[PDB]
Amino acid sequence: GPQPISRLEQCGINANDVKKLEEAGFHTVEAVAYAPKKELINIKGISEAKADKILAEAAKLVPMGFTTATEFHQRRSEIIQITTGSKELDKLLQGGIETGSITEMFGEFRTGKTQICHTLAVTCQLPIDRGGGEGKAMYIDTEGTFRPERLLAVAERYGLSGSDVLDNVAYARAFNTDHQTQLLYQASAMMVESRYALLIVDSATALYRTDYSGRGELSARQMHLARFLRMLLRLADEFGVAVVITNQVVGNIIAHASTTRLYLRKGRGETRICKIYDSPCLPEAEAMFAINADGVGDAKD
Amino acid sequence: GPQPISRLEQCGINANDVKKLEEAGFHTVEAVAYAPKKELINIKGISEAKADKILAEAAKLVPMGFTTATEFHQRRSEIIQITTGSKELDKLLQGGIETGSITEMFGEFRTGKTQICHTLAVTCQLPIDRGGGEGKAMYIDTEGTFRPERLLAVAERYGLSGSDVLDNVAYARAFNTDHQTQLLYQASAMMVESRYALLIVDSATALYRTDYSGRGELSARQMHLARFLRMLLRLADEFGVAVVITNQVNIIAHASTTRLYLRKGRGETRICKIYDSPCLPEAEAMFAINADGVGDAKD
Amino acid sequence: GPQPISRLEQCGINANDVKKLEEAGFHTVEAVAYAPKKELINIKGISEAKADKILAEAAKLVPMGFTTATEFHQRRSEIIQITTGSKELDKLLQGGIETGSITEMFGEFRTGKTQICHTLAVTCQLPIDRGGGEGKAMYIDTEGTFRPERLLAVAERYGLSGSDVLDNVAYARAFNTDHQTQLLYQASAMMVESRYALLIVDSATALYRTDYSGRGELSARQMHLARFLRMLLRLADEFGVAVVITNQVVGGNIIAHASTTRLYLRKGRGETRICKIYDSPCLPEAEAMFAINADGVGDAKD
Ligand SMILES: Nc1ncnc2c1ncn2[C@@H]1O[C@H](COP(=O)(O)OP(=O)(O)OP(=O)(O)O)[C@@H](O)[C@H]1O
Ligand SMILES: Nc1ncnc2c1ncn2[C@@H]1O[C@H](COP(=O)(O)OP(=O)(O)OP(=O)(O)O)[C@@H](O)[C@H]1O
Ligand SMILES: Nc1ncnc2c1ncn2[C@@H]1O[C@H](COP(=O)(O)OP(=O)(O)OP(=O)(O)O)[C@@H](O)[C@H]1O
Ligand SMILES: [Mg+2]
Ligand SMILES: [Mg+2]
Ligand SMILES: [Mg+2]
């Protein structure tokens, strides 16, 4: 129950004003309730009086009162944890990737940040009883490393139709930072008509280094990156989907944006070691995994 | 003895005018005595004549004369200090978190600002004789980092019923600065029916960076934050509860009474340092983050 | 279908402004859509208003919306894979050299970086049904190791006219880094009038060590190399040709994401050589052995 924006018109908001909200980026009742007063006023063709009518009726459908901690604890029992393909890696995450939050994977090059994303892009279509999310996947690529054939190998592992998996994965390559943020506007509208479960941005920081290379323009890219991260957190709270982003390390804005940070480093041979950095519920522990032809699997020395 | 506002009606003020004061945020005689003349005039449906009647009769129940330092010293002896879970950390605070004042914890990410809040959200329910506050907990979250499972582990450490602990913790996530301030209005009404002891805002500065990002709007966000901090100080003086806020790293200079700096040590160990304080000396203390909550370091 | 830049003039942009885009390096509508806002504004005689009209109308011809994974799978199915001459080496690359992307071959001296380039310079002229690209070859040399006689021996192996093979190979030796980058401007104009299929730069890192030898100039050569690498990746997306560069490792961290497939070469017994794949999004870490024969790069024959 994400409260479609069409129900906001039933409260009293005229249908023409709803069109302005959809083109602005708001497609749910929870989105306008998330927005302050200044967000609706800045929209073209919306006065302060019209903004107050939206916030009042939006709070009726989505209440924001105080709830008991035992109630929010039961809300965590309804959270879906997507498997990563490795049993030892799933134990490290106390179940898997938590939906509705941003997960950051920072590590050296060639470690396997992109490989983990391709594996998760298929496991989200798995049934919920098998550790999936029963939703479509969304892959935003910036390195040119997207390979649909790698998705077919993961589908064969769990016995899913490779053709149906590719039909449920949306792909788009961002050419620049302005294009990278612009793709999120189309992403919000697509998640309203169909159910998605995973949003992948690989890489989320590559385009911010090539465009703004000067020293006086450092504050400019930080303003653009902060605005890009805020839209990711809004989409996570809006649709309850898992957000996975990659970062290349040879960065203080992705501190509070990410809810769970993962550090990847290379081990002996094809084995890799993963460690949890920042997390509110998971303890600092490590787990070993490997990168096989079937995707991300368990280590087999 | 904070003089509830119901006694103000007994002096001569009609009860209907008192209802307008409660909807504004004033629920005690000390609260309306705290407010100047301009605060009551700005309230809808209150004239200057009605405001003068309130302040005059409020001074009878709450006098504003000079008192001996030994008398105010005994009033500070009644202040409750909530334990933090670490014995070395409790010694640093000369007892623990002081109720009725704002405590700010500023530090880098992953230091443990949220972990201290979850630990204090359970230790505040302990009996006062056991180092608690004998009151419910209130958690206002802005990062999405609230974990009820962390509260259960701390409750099992001190031998408390996990179900009863979750029933005594109020949780609400603020989506923006306007929503963050709006939650305090509901918070004041909840503290009237039941006794609370701790108010947590994590983070108190995160939403003020996401909403107001421009440069021409810099003066606007400072006015909204200053008004938010004054409401926290008003709630602390009104109900005598502890206010704990986190900040990720000038307006919170005089607003905050005790500042705590957190930095990471080797492994799971953490180091805490006191920044600004009128009674606590500049000292440091070491603590750890265990599965049972915030405990002492054990090399 | 890369949408040539001449179609951008049909939308409303005057043809004279399009001429400035060709002199800058943009020859398709997908190229100006690839470029951000700052790239077009920095060009002499182009204002922000003219740049906004280009980017807006370019998005109309080349949409930048989300596509199904099955659609991008068919886009990779249309990519031409040029054979390397060794059957075991072609199996290692899941087909051959991928066009439209940069392929790096880093290895010690005498391993065979130059020999592989000469072999690919002839196999690209083969028919696509025979594993070729049906396009001309372009060789940018920096070591003075270009030998047309090696091209004639490879042409005799595949039964091609040696005279016609030499007529379809463009050669130019870069004397310095500034000359190395300047040759790419001439390369873009040549690929518009005639069809090319392969661009070879051997070596792509030799001139950046001899020219910039000081320590205070280290940050200067990295800016020039990074700008040079971006132009190679842009030409690959623009013309859909394969880009092969060689590097001596006694590599750089800037060619990390720029290169799509890295190959490591080491010497075996005799004339045999061993090849290994380093970084790749689709190819697994595996090794393959090959040899250097008089006919070019062939399979190992103990
Ligand atoms: N088909 C495959 N089968 C098995 N293993 C593979 C396959 N393809 C790639 N790998 C392995 O996965 C790794 C790929 O690393 P990856 O491309 O994910 O790095 P990355 O984190 O994306 O770095 P960057 O994005 O900065 O280039 C390689 O080291 C390789 O060993
Ligand atoms: N179950 C657990 N057992 C032991 N330690 C834990 C457990 N869960 C979390 N931790 C530790 O507590 C820390 C949590 O950091 P925390 O989330 O408090 O940072 P923070 O102050 O909220 O930073 P920010 O709010 O700016 O993101 C982690 O570094 C982790 O090592
Ligand atoms: N006509 C030929 N017949 C057989 N083998 C040959 C012939 N010509 C050259 N070779 C072999 O090919 C190899 C050439 O190595 P090559 O010049 O490709 O090294 P490289 O990778 O260019 O090193 P660098 O360019 O860094 O000096 C020689 O070792 C030689 O044995
Ligand atoms: Mg990658
Ligand atoms: Mg936190
Ligand atoms: Mg060579």
Numbering used by the authors:
A (entry chain E): 21 to 270, 289 to 339
B (entry chain F): 21 to 269, 290 to 339
C (entry chain D): 21 to 270, 288 to 339
Publication passage describing the model:
An essential mechanism for repairing DNA double‐strand breaks is homologous recombination (HR). One of its core catalysts is human RAD51 (hRAD51), which assembles as a helical nucleoprotein filament on single‐stranded DNA, promoting DNA‐strand exchange. The NPF is responsible for DNA sequence homology recognition in a duplex DNA, usually the sister chromatid, and formation of a joint intermediate that will serve as a priming site for DNA synthesis needed to copy the missing information (Benson et al, 1994).
To provide further insight into hRAD51 function and investigate its apparent ability to adopt different conformations in the polymeric state, we obtained a crystal structure of the hRAD51‐ATP filament. Remarkably, the protein crystallized in a monoclinic space group, with two complete turns of helical filament in the asymmetric unit. Thus, unlike previous crystal structures that contained a monomeric or dimeric RecA/RadA/RAD51, related to proximal protomers by hexagonal or trigonal symmetry, our crystal structure yielded information on the conformation of 14 independent hRAD51 molecules, in a filament state and bound to ATP. In the crystal, ATP‐bound hRAD51 forms a continuous right‐handed filament with seven subunits per helical turn. The heptameric repeat of the helical hRAD51‐ATP filament has a pitch of 128.0 Å and a protomer rise of 18.3 Å. Inspection of the 12 independent dimer interfaces in the two heptameric turns of the hRAD51‐ATP filament structure showed the presence of two distinct dimer conformations, alternating along the filament, in a qualitatively similar arrangement to what had been observed for yeast Rad51 (Conway et al, 2004). Comparison of the two dimer types by superposition shows that, relative to the first hRAD51 protomer in the dimer, the second protomer undergoes a rigid‐body movement comprising of a slight tilt towards the filament axis coupled to a small increase in twist. The pivot point for this composite rotation is centred at the dimer interface, with residues surrounding the ATP‐binding site displaying the least movement. Modelling of hRAD51‐ATP filaments constituted entirely of one or the other dimer type yields filaments with different pitch and rise (134 and 18.4 Å vs. 112 and 16.9 Å), reflecting a looser (7.3 hRAD51 chains/turn) or tighter (6.6 hRAD51 chains/turn) winding of the helical hRAD51 assembly around the filament axis. The values for the rise of the two filament models, at 1.84 and 1.69 nm, fit within the contour lengths measured for the two states of the hRAD51‐ATP filament in the optical tweezers (2.2 ± 0.6 and 1.4 ± 0.3 nm).
